[PDB]
Amino acid sequence: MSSVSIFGLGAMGTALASRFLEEKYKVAVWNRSPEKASPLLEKGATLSHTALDGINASDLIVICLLDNAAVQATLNSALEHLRGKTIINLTNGTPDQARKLSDLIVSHGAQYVHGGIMATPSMIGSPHALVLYSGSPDAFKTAEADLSVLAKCIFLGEDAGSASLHDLALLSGMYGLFSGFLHATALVRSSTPAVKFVDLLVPWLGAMTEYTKGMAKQIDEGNYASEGSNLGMQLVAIQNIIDASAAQQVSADFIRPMKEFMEKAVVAGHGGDDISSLIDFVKS
Amino acid sequence: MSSVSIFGLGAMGTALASRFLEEKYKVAVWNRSPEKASPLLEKGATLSHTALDGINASDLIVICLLDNAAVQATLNSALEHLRGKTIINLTNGTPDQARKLSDLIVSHGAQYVHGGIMATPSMIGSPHALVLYSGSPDAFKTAEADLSVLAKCIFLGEDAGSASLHDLALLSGMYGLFSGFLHATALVRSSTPAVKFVDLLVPWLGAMTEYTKGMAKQIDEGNYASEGSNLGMQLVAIQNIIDASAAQQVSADFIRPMKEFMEKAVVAGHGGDDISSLIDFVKS
Ligand SMILES: NC(=O)C1=CN([C@@H]2O[C@H](COP(=O)(O)OP(=O)(O)OC[C@H]3O[C@@H](n4cnc5c(N)ncnc54)[C@H](OP(=O)(O)O)[C@@H]3O)[C@@H](O)[C@H]2O)C=CC1
Numbered sequence: 117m118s119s120v121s122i123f124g125l126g127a128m129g130t131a132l133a134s135r136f137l138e139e140k141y142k143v144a145v146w147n148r149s150p151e152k153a154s155p156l157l158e159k160g161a162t163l164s165h166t167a168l169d170g171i172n173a174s175d176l177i178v179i180c181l182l183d184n185a186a187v188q189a190t191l192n193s194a195l196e197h198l199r200g201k202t203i204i205n206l207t208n209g210t211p212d213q214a215r216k217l218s219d220l221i222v223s224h225g226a227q228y229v230h231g232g233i234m235a236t237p238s239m240i241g242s243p244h245a246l247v248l249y250s251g252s253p254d255a256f257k258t259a260e261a262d263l264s265v266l267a268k269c270i271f272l273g274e275d276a277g278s279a280s281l282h283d284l285a286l287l288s289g290m291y292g293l294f295s296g297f298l299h300a301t302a303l304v305r306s307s308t309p310a311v312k313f314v315d316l317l318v319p320w321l322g323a324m325t326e327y328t329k330g331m332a333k334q335i336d337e338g339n340y341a342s343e344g345s346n347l348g349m350q351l352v353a354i355q356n357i358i359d360a361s362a363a364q365q366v367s368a369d370f371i372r373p374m375k376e377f378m379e380k381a382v383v384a385g386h387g388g389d390d391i392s393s394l395i396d397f398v399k400s
Numbered sequence: 401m402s403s404v405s406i407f408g409l410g411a412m413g414t415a416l417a418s419r420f421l422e423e424k425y426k427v428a429v430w431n432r433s434p435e436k437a438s439p440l441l442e443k444g445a446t447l448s449h450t451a452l453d454g455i456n457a458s459d460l461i462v463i464c465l466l467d468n469a470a471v472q473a474t475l476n477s478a479l480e481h482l483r484g485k486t487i488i489n490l491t492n493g494t495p496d497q498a499r500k501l502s503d504l505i506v507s508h509g510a511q512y513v514h515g516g517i518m519a520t521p522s523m524i525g526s527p528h529a530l531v532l533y534s535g536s537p538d539a540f541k542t543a544e545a546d547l548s549v550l551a552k553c554i555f556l557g558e559d560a561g562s563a564s565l566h567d568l569a570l571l572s573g574m575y576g577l578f579s580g581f582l583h584a585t586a587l588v589r590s591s592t593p594a595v596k597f598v599d600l601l602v603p604w605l606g607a608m609t610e611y612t613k614g615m616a617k618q619i620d621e622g623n624y625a626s627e628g629s630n631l632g633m634q635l636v637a638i639q640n641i642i643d644a645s646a647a648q649q650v651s652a653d654f655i656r657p658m659k660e661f662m663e664k665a666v667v668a669g670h671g672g673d674d675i676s677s678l679i680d681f682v683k684s
């Protein structure tokens with residue numbers, strides 16, 4: 117009685133398909149390279165030999181492809197067969213790509229929800245997974261029970277591009293954290309095992325992640341008066357990081373953006389302010 | 401009976417001096433701009449009118465100045481009066497600066513410990529504060545009871561530059577996290593309050609901070625085989641972050657280093673590997 121049709125059997129699409137199968141859904145699967153379907157067919161999925169077969173397999177279509185060019189190309193042949201269906205697009209893309217694809221899909225008589233998967237494939241089906249959704253509220257509402265098999269759901273509203281905006285912002289936070297981890301580990305690699313260093317680093321990153329909640333407060337209030345850690349002193353520290361990196365033949369490129377934004381803010385009069393003040397200098 | 405002599409009454413030196421006073425130490429204080437001493441003198445500190453007075457006030461000298469040029473300049477007049485003293489230098493600097501200053505100080509008959517304060521001034525005296533120390537093991541041992549008034553202590557060994565290496569690496573981790581927070585908040589600023597967004601961001605950064613412990617494992621083992629999140633797919637995601645940033649007139653400079661390192665690794669054959677593989681590409 118419960119059915120879904122999946123497009124994309126990469127790492128993530130495979131994990132989606134596997135989870136629906138585990139929960140005894142009727143699951144159709146489609147992939148450009150159809151041999152990625154075999155492990156799923158053995159577990160009870162039906163192969164969509166063509167994209168149109170996948171469109172006709174269910175009124176709930178879940179797409180998870182590399183990029184939204186692949187999504188458009190895959191659907192293009194079948195756009196006249198989308199009437200009445202719900203498209204859940206989990207492909208990473210920009211807000212604008214989701215808004216334009218939403219317009220196209222809605223013009224063909226279907227409804228569109230975009231989703232940003234904040235999880236790795238192994239996390240699918242666990243309480244640690246979260247998917248951010250936006251687009252059709254009606255379609256999300258009627259599909260929510262099915263989507264909750266994959267992950268916790270947060271619905272962000274009717275703008276089809278809001279899920280990808282929030283996804284890409286969360287990923288940009290991640291990439292900053294990973295940039296810092298790689299820089300830090302590279303600096304100590306010749307001295308300390310990385311596993312030994314992360315016993316220092318992880319608690320420290322936790323403490324600095326806590327310093328962010330109040331930074332968000334300062335940002336929402338426009339109040340950057342230093343609480344003890346001024347930018348002049350921080351620019352010296354950053355230059356010491358740059359210089360120590362060079363001495364060890366480690367690249368300091370990860371921290372040069374921060375130095376440049378901090379220098380701009382200091383030129384503008386923030387040498388005695390906190391780092392939240394940089395929010396006004398990250399434009400352009 | 402318990403005494404200390406502090407050099408530097410900036411934000412951090414003031415917090416050190418205040419904490420020792422609270423614990424009923426005899427505390428001498430020195431600062432280039434001596435009017436920063438008044439709040440401390442009112443609480444029972446003695447003013448060092450000259451650097452030599454500060455050197456002669458105690459055999460435990462704690463220095464906390466902007467940079468190690470200020471440290472050298474401050475001590476230079478008094479180098480012949482350091483015999484028998486312990487210098488605890490908490491000034492941020494490079495490993496080499498600490499090694500050279502250590503050599504100079506030891507040549508003048510004193511002992512030298514460098515310290516990296518992993519705390520803000522308000523954290524001094526709390527269990528959340530940590531100071532990383534390296535240099536003379538004997539001097540650290542006999543001063544440890546006094547230093548523990550400020551913060552938890554970790555001693556890293558006899559290399560006078562190890563405390564600053566580990567400090568600067570931890571700070572580089574911090575700056576990566578803060579780079580990601582600023583990028584993320586800048587992207588959503590026009591859509592969402594920052595305080596609302598951090599309710600998503602903080603748990604997410606926690607989950608990604610956990611992903612780092614296994615990354616350290618992969619690094620120490622040289623084994624980068626993907627567990628589900630390949631670099632080819634990540635480079636697409638990063639480009640989507642760059643493009644979404646431009647559309648919103650937000651700078652994407654924070655993530656360009658990561659894109660460049662990831663592109664280099666993919667050229668070298670890691671398109672199907674995990675992000676830990678970048679550790680070999682952050683050189684130069
Ligand atoms: N950790 C993860 O892996 C996460 C992934 N995501 C997102 O999920 C999506 C899928 O990622 P993931 O499964 O990891 O990526 P993969 O690299 O494992 O798989 C990419 C998928 O896209 C397909 N594809 C690529 N180009 C085309 C094309 N031109 N036409 C049709 N299909 C094509 C591939 O088909 P083929 O098999 O034929 O090559 C494959 O199904 C991405 O948007 C990613 O950002 C989100 C969160 C986490």
Ligand SMILES: NC(=O)C1=CN([C@@H]2O[C@H](COP(=O)(O)OP(=O)(O)OC[C@H]3O[C@@H](n4cnc5c(N)ncnc54)[C@H](OP(=O)(O)O)[C@@H]3O)[C@@H](O)[C@H]2O)C=CC1
Nearest residue numbers: 344345349408409410411412432433465466470491492520
């Ligand atoms: N959150 C923080 O504030 C933290 C700071 N630190 C480190 O602690 C150190 C002190 O930082 P903080 O107190 O915040 O910085 P401040 O900017 O508040 O104070 C800087 C101090 O250095 C002195 N100084 C600067 N140039 C000279 C000079 N040429 N000769 C003599 N003294 C000079 C200033 O004297 P004057 O008052 O006369 O200007 C002042 O005492 C730095 O190395 C920093 O990295 C470590 C961790 C956290």
Ligand SMILES: CNC1CCCCC1
Nearest residue numbers: 345350353518519520
């Ligand atoms: C040296 N820079 C400081 C370190 C402690 C946190 C705030 C910034």
Ligand SMILES: CNC1CCCCC1
Nearest residue numbers: 234235236629634637
């Ligand atoms: C889209 N890139 C992925 C997101 C989830 C964590 C690993 C990297």
Ligand SMILES: [Mg+2]
Nearest residue numbers: 182183185186
């Ligand atoms: Mg392509």
Ligand SMILES: [Mg+2]
Nearest residue numbers: 466467469470
């Ligand atoms: Mg100076």
